[PDB]
Amino acid sequence: TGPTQRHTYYSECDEFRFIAPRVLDEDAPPEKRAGVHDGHLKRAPKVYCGGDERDVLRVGSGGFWPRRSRLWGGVDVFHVYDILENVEGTVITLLGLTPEGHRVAVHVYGTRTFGWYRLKAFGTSSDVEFNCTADNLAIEGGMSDLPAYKLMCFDIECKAGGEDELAFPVAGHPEDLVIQISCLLYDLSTTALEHVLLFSLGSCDLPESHLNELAARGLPTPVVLEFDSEFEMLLAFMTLVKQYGPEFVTGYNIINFDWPFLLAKLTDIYKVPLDGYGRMNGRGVFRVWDRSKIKVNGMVNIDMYGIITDKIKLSSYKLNAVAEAVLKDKKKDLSYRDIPAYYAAGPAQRGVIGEYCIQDSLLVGQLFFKFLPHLELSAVARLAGINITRTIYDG
Ligand SMILES: [Ca+2]
Ligand SMILES: [Ca+2]
Numbered sequence: 001t002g003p004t005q006r007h008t009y010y011s012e013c014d015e016f017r018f019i020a021p022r023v024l025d026e027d028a029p030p031e032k033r034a035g036v037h038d039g040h041l042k043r044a045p046k047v048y049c050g051g052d053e054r055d056v057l058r059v060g061s062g063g064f065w066p067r068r069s070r071l072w073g074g075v076d077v078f079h080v081y082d083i084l085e086n087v088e089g090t091v092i093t094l095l096g097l098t099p100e101g102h103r104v105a106v107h108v109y110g111t112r113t114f115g116w117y118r119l120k121a122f123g124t125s126s127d128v129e130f131n132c133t134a135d136n137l138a139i140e141g142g143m144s145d146l147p148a149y150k151l152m153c154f155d156i157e158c159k160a161g162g163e164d165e166l167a168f169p170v171a172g173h174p175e176d177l178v179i180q181i182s183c184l185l186y187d188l189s190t191t192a193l194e195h196v197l198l199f200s201l202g203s204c205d206l207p208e209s210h211l212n213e214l215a216a217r218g219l220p221t222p223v224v225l226e227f228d229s230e231f232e233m234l235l236a237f238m239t240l241v242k243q244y245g246p247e248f249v250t251g252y253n254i255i256n257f258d259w260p261f262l263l264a265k266l267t268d269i270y271k272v273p274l275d276g277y278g279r280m281n282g283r284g285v286f287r288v289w290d291r292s293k294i295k296v297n298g299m300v301n302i303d304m305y306g307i308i309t310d311k312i313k314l315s316s317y318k319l320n321a322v323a324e325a326v327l328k329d330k331k332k333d334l335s336y337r338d339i340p341a342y343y344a345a346g347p348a349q350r351g352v353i354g355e356y357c358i359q360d361s362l363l364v365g366q367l368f369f370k371f372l373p374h375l376e377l378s379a380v381a382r383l384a385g386i387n388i389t390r391t392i393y394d395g
Pocket of ligand 2: 155156157357360
């Protein structure tokens with residue numbers, strides 16, 4: 001039988017373009033440690049974690065990252081945060097959470113924005129889905145606290161791989177690789193940090209001092225996901241994005257750098273269709289366009305750089321200067337000038353790259369929870385009668 005509408009995200013993958021820095025071949029002689037390998041490889045993408053080893057696209061009990069996924073590849077009151085329009089007649093899809101924290105999509109038929117509602121083959125990555133008409137819906141008065149939506153705060157590190165290692169990385173150059181992704185998952189209602197993930201191209205041993213500091217701050221112990229190539233890492237990040245499905249996503253300059261870089265790699269280098277990687281399982285919007293906008297269906301992208309430049313007056317809006325100014329937190333900064341020499345040194349030094357990548361995402365979380373931009377944007381979305389996505393990206 002299978003799904004009525006085809007899922008277009010990778011639920012399976014048995015061959016891919018393998019691109020990796022040759023310096024990770026710590027067993028190879030120096031004459032062959034320069035540049036990147038770039039070829040095809042006929043095996044399933046895989047991820048390593050703490051000595052254990054899994055296929056990236058396998059779903060089961062032993063997963064290295066959290067999921068909020070009912071369906072994978074077809075295998076098996078509410079609060080609305082976002083609304084999709086699609087054709088089946090025009091169907092209006094309300095995306096949301098119940099008080100229990102189940103993900104819902106309610107498909108409203110017969111038509112020709114943020115708050116609680118009452119009711120009176122899935123098209124999406126939800127736990128339950130409903131067909132109804134607009135008369136089956138009413139605003140649930142007396143409910144105003146946000147359900148347990150999830151925020152993903154993320155940051156990429158890139159490494160230019162051409163004859164100048166200090167050159168600004170260009171996504172269209174196959175040898176300019178994403179080498180790490182920090183991915184911090186928070187509960188948006190309680191503000192609790194629930195997971196600290198570091199995606200790493202190559203082996204990566206975070207330092208004891210960093211692990212002890214996070215433990216002393218009472219924060220979750222980081223999970224390091226190690227990968228042999230850029231595609232396996234990018235596929236796994238997108239797999240987490242689809243499987244965990246953070247309703248809100250934040251970062252610093254993620255709209256003008258991180259998202260455009262990732263999506264350029266995924267689209268141009270690897271030929272991965274992005275239209276099933278949002279909330280919808282295929283034929284959904286997932287696009288960056290030019291400073292940039294972004295639309296990912298079912299995901300609210302909030303760039304803290306935009307929020308902060310709009311809100312504080314500063315001599316510099318570099319994340320470090322902002323952290324010193326706003327949080328009073330004097331972050332020590334790893335230079336982009338350091339990254340190539342550290343990356344080539346071994347898993348301990350790639351661990352130092354990892355620490356600073358995690359610390360960056362942690363500051364952006366603190367900034368996020370200070371300004372609470374989602375509260376400002378949802379308030380405007382309610383008042384102005386438009387969805388929160390359009391509230392951000394339209395004038
Ligand atoms: Ca960033
Ligand atoms: Ca960074």
